[PDB]
Amino acid sequence: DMYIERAGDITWEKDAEVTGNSPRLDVALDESGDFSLVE
Amino acid sequence: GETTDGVYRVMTRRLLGSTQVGVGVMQEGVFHTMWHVTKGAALRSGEGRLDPYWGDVKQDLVSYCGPWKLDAAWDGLSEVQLLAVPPGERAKNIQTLPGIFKTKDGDIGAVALDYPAGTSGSPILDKCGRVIGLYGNGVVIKNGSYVSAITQGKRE
Ligand SMILES: Cn1cc(C(F)(F)F)nc1[C@H]1CCCNC1
Numbered sequence: 001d002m003y004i005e006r007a008g009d010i011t012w013e014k015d016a017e018v019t020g021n022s023p024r025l026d027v028a029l030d031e032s033g034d035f036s037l038v039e
Numbered sequence: 040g041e042t043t044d045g046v047y048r049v050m051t052r053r054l055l056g057s058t059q060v061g062v063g064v065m066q067e068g069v070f071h072t073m074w075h076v077t078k079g080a081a082l083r084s085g086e087g088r089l090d091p092y093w094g095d096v097k098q099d100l101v102s103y104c105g106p107w108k109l110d111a112a113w114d115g116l117s118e119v120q121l122l123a124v125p126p127g128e129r130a131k132n133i134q135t136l137p138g139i140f141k142t143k144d145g146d147i148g149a150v151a152l153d154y155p156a157g158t159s160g161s162p163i164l165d166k167c168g169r170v171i172g173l174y175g176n177g178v179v180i181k182n183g184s185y186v187s188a189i190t191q192g193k194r195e
Contacts, residue, residue, distance in 0.1 A: 002060065003083040004040075004047040008130040010064065012120055012168050020135035020151045023186060027140045027178060033074065033099040035140070035178045035188065 040084030042068060046124055046162060049076055059126035062160035064170055070103040072160040073175050073190065077101060099176040100192045110194035111169035113137060113148040119189070120164045121150055121174055126157040132164075140178075140188050148189035150174060163189050 026038040042065065049061040049072060061076030070082065070089055074096055082089040082103060094101035102108070113119060120132045137148040148171075150163060159175025177187035 001053065001083060002049055002051045002077060002080060004049055004063065004065075004070065004089070006041055006043065007046045007048050007062070007124045008122070009045050010066075010122060010162055010164065010168060010170060012164055012166055013132040016120055016132040016134045018118070018134040020133070022136045022138035023149070023151055023180060024139045025141065025149070025178070025180060025186065027142055029097065029142060029144075031097060033097045033176065035176065037178060037180065 040087035042084070046122055046130060048124055049082070049160065059157040061157060061175070062124045064109065064160075064162050064173070066170070067105070067108045069105040069108050071107065071109055071173070071192070072101055072103075073173055074099045074101045075176070076160050098192060099190060100173070102192070106195050107192035108194060109170045109172075109192060111165055111167075111171045112191060113163075113165070113171045113189055115148070117166065119148075119150070119171065121152055121161060122164060123152070123154055123158055123161050123174070125154055137189060138186060140186075148172070149177070149186050150189060151184065151186045153185040
């Protein structure tokens with residue numbers, strides 16, 4: 001039995017930590033909602 | 040129960056202690072999460088009950104109390120923010136420039152940020168604070184790193 005608990009407001013925060021790259025990938029999405037790499 | 044707009048943790052007491060299985064967004068009276076977080080089960084908010092209203096395993100999304108309300112889209116150029124809500128930790132915003140998932144049915148934005156499985160459902164936002172999608176359905180690439188799609192539903 002699942003329950004929900006508030007964690008915060010949804011707002012853009014100025015001067016947030018900036019990280020992560022931007023890869024361009026060929027992918028496939030199957031009927032089960034699973035993504036896979038196309039090679 | 041609490042129907043205030045915002046980001047929420049999805050918890051369960053079925054396992055050891057209280058475990059965070061995911062995250063969701065309450066907007067316009069509707070709770071939005073990823074399908075793999077709840078598997079379509081009913082939710083509790085204090086003393087109230089939230090029933091599933093719409094869901095789709097392939098899109099990996101589900102809405103409660105009403106139809107999917109989130110309609111903003113990534114502009115394809117700007118940085119975005121993942122409002123990550125990790126298990127046992129405070130909500131935090133991470134800014135990033137999304138990559139692209141290229142499919143036979145079109146291109147989707149993607150965020151190359153790795154967080155525990157229980158962070159699934161955390162919202163991805165634009166500079167106006169609008170939810171452009173949810174985090175947590177992705178792939179492991181050649182490097183071994185994790186990349187999530189920016190998953191957005193359709194507002195009827
Ligand atoms: C963020 N996330 C979501 C899920 C899944 F369970 F598949 F839904 N798995 C992850 C990450 C967890 C840390 C290692 N890399 C994958």
